[PDB]
RNA sequence: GGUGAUGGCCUACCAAGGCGACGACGGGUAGCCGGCCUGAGAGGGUGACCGGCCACACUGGGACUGAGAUACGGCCCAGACUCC
RNA sequence: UAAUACGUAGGGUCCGAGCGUUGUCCGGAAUUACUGGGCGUAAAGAGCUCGUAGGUGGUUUGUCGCGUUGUUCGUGAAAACUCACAGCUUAACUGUGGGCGUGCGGGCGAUACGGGCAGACUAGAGUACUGCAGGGGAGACUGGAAUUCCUGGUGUAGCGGUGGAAUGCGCAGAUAUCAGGAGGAACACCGGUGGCGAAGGCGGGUCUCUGGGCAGUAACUGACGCUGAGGAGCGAAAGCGUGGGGAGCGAACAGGAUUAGAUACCCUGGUAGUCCACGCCGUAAACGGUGGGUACUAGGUGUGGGUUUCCUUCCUUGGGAUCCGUGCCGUAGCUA
RNA sequence: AGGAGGUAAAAAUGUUCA
């Protein structure tokens, strides 16, 4: 069955952003607002809405492309996966693409990137490379 | 294979409420009658494997409904397999 | 594989052959030439190499070339015997090495005498 | 009871438990480590000098003495070997 | 026989009191891949399911602070390694100081994530209700065609068989034809890129018993889920056992033919077996050579089952929407 | 464009480096 929505929702982003679709509606959790959050600030999305289904709540990420259908995400790559979760000192943080990348740190600080995270002298759990 | 008269008798006396089905006392006794139904049918005709297989399919939803109420209140599970003639 | 599959089982790399094993870890072993004599290589080769079965002191026969131009081996001559393939050779892994206190020098090397245990001529 | 000391360490009795697929019990190999070599690193291999710990002192067993004993250059016994 | 690969000379090159060889280890080897591989055809998906341990875990509130993370203390001997300095004339080496000591234990914090605990929820899962399709399975009974055999007429000299023949069957009345009977096995047409089943596999009809699935309703429970080591079960055909049965087919076997030979292909026969009952076996190109579950990612076109809806003939397999399937084609992407 | 089935009987092998 499921056992990640933060890959579910890495994927649906990864798969849409390949085949250029401009909204990627899916369930909804805080910890994917917030990971949407992120991304949205360092600028890998254009926006997210949260709004209701018939059940729950769906986010929709209204993602972002340039004028000539550049990707605004060239790859996501979850890390801390279940079976096998990856934590990082605020030291041996990683940086993603030489740091032109964003990880997504989980420290009790808050959802934060590892630039972030090393500003703060936390670490993690590390959720994803979304370069 | 259970009628709906037979059925509304199990849930009257195993079910919590009077429109519960999908509780797992109410499961655990429909499955309890079809697996008796079922057996006797074997008991009959040895070579049915297909109906066998169902059969077994069958026991592994109750093993997994009655793991699931020792798991919550342990006092609902014994009442059930006592009420129902079962061992675990 | 699976994280679960690995610490459950773990990867074992493959076991690597023990090779010389006549040797026993020993990189040069004494041995009595058992039987020197002369074998025909491989079908796109053909020559009359020359090897002896010696008898090593690990207690193991084992066949082995003779290198250079010529040599002065009988049987019951002590032997001093190295590592080394010669490919159109099938059943031959090791080779025998001047110095031995049997096996001298080759006549007239003057390029590769020390592969050979031939002294320099001053 | 015994020990310097806790403890089946030992003993009488009592209960029938304890360990095992998370690999008991066995078989094989091996002294362990700091370290060394390699390697981008992870890792792999290794355990020489040097330094620490352990074990052993012909083999096996045993205690005595003593603050302290595997008592190498101590004791007793048995055994193999060497010698008078 | 015209060797830059052998041997020697020159000459060059790499090192240099060393140079080469052997042995051993690591590397290169992403060649056991945690970093860092893969499994359609390259080696690689168990034949398929069930399910134990285990691993894993949808949304959400609160808490614990176990994991995690921060900080601090202690320890992490010295030597080593590393950085810097200093000293043996330099270097090696040596010393000094720091760092390292990849960790562990205590203390004090944080609580996002995992987890525990206590709950809540319905989107997963399962139940109930209504319907639906179906060679799903087992048992019993039963049908007709056809073959073979038997009996009886008619009927006479060939039939059969092949590439061509011959064995063979017949002339004691065969083949053929008609009628009747016995028995066995398989079920034409329906019947197909079709349906069901976990797979194997399932096709005459009826009855009985029985399993699974799908759609719709959203009444119910409220993560109960997924996978599954081992294990258990099912598991084509052949085969084995016991007992029946035995028409056809038919390994073996026997003749005939072909052939250089033919232990074969072809022909004529023909035993086990194929069939039934109960059990063993437990394999297969058990193949989609593709494990299971879940989510997402262009479409087109067929077809099977079901729900609805819109033109409305208000005829209607007219079309559309949707769920589940099953096929063909084709993007992106992937692939040697 | 619309519409049954067929036949070729058997007939082997290939020292050298290439």
Not at chain 1, 75 to 94: C, D, E, I
Not at chain 1, 113 to 118: E, K, N, S, Y
Not at chain 2, 21 to 30: D, F, I, K, N, Y
Request: aromatic share 4%.
């Amino acid at each position: 069955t499921m056992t990640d929505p933060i890959a579910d929702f890495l994927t649906r982003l990864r798969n849409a952003n390949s085949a250029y679709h401009d909204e990627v509606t899916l369930p909804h959790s805080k910890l994917k607002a917030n990971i949407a959050e992120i991304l949205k600030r360092e600028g890998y999305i254009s926006d997210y809405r949260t709004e209701d289904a018939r059940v729950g709540k769906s986010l929709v990420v209204q993602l972002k492309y340039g004028p000539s259908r550049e990707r605004s995400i060239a790859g996501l790559r979850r890390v801390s996966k279940p079976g096998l979760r990856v934590y990082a000192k605020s030291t041996n943080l990683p940086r993603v693409l030489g740091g032109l990348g964003v990880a997504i740190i989980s420290t009790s600080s808050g959802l934060l990137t590892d630039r972030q995270a090393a500003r703060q002298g936390v670490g993690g759990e590390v959720l994803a490379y979304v370069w | 294979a259970l009628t709906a008269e037979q059925k509304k008798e199990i849930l009257g006396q195993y079910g919590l409420h009077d429109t519960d089905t999908g509780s797992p006392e109410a499961q655990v006794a429909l499955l309890t009658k079809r697996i008796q139904d079922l057996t006797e049918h074997l008991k009959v005709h040895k070579h049915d494997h297909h109906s066998r297989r169902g059969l077994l399919l069958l026991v592994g939803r109750r093993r997994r409904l009655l793991k699931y109420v020792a798991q919550v209140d342990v006092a609902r599970y014994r009442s059930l397999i006592e009420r129902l003639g079962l061992r675990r | 594989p699976t994280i679960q599959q690995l610490v459950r089982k773990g990867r074992r790399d493959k076991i690597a052959k023990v090779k010389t094993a006549a040797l026993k870890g020993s990189p040069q072993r004494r041995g009595v030439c058992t039987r020197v004599y002369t074998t025909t290589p491989k079908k796109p080769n053909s020559a009359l190499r020359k090897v002896a079965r010696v008898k090593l002191t690990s207690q193991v026969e084992v066949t082995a070339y003779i290198p250079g131009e010529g040599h002065n081996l009988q049987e019951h001559s002590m032997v001093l015997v190295r590592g080394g393939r010669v490919k159109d050779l099938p059943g031959v892994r090791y080779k025998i090495i001047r110095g031995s206190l049997d096996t001298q020098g080759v006549k007239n090397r003057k390029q590769a005498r020390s592969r050979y245990g031939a002294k320099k001529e001053k």
